[PDB]
């Protein structure tokens, strides 16, 4: 329920730690014409599934700098031959070096790359923004537009879905099979209800507004109800609903 990405109803937590998934959580079952068939995920005789760690999916600073120097020398050469041939870098020549340099090659193709060339002292200004805004900025040291996005979580999320058993393994924990959707393909969430979003601005009291900010949780608990509401996880007596 924690490390499932937000698109599948989970919280999308990022783990800088060592969490083991019990094998009993990697089992699902589906019904077809021949009856009910049960599936696991760990065919290989390995240990219990271990969620990917945000440790491994970040390139170290030293390798990052070496890559930046190599990539920028390569770009300097490519530009040198581009000027000679009266051509411009067509985003295909710069395919092997896309998310590598410290000023990410992404920034060279940014749409607003002309107005940012007149933006000077942006790192000092970003650092000094702490004296104007009442929220601390974790990325106080860098700017996404100027310096690029110096990290990627595509591999992390891919391995997180793979480690949890994929969509089939994840959604056995949810009320998805209770919705009787034929498939998960043409599906979309609605983050705010049609009426819940209309009440964000209707002059509600502090108590009235505080209780309305817990509505999404009432859905989250519903999404993971087959797993949260279990005898294994909540030891003790059980009470059935009156109807």
């Amino acid at each position: 329920v924690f490390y499932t990405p937000k698109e599948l109803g989970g919280l999308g937590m990022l783990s800088m730690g060592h969490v083991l998934i019990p094998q009993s959580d990697l089992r699902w079952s589906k019904q077809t014409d021949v009856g009910i068939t049960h599936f696991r995920s760990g065919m290989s005789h390995e240990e219990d599934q271990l969620i990917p760690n945000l440790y491994r999916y970040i390139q170290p600073w030293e390798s990052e700098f070496i890559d930046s120097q190599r990539v920028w020398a390569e770009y300097a050469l490519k530009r040198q031959e581009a000027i000679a041939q009266n051509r411009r870098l067509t985003l295909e020549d710069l395919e092997d070096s896309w998310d590598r340099g410290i000023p990410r090659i992404n920034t060279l193709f940014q749409k607003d790359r002309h107005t940012l060339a007149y933006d000077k002292g942006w790192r000092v200004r970003t650092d000094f923004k702490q004296y104007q805004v009442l929220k601390q900025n974790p990325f106080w040291w860098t700017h996404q537009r100027h310096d690029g996005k110096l990290w990627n979580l595509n591999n992390y999320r891919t391995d997180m879905i793979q480690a949890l058993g994929g969509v089939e393994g994840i959604l056995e924990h949810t009320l998805f099979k209770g919705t009787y959707f034929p498939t998960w393909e043409g599906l979309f969430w609605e983050k705010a209800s049609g009426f819940e979003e209309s009440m964000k601005w209707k002059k509600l009291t502090n108590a009235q507004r505080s209780g309305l900010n817990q509505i999404p949780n009432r859905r989250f608990t519903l999404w993971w109800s087959p797993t949260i509401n279990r005898a294994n996880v909540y030891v003790g007596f059980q009470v059935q609903l009156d109807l």
Binding site: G17, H18, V19, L20, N53, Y55, R56, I58, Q59, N155
Partner: peptide
């Protein structure tokens, strides 16, 4: 099986930080 996030001080120290990244 508890689901508690265990510290990796000394755990998973064999692998580098460049692994599983492209």
């Amino acid at each position: 099986p508890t689901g508690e996030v265990l510290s990796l001080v000394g755990k998973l120290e064999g692998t580098r930080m460049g692994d599983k990244a492209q």
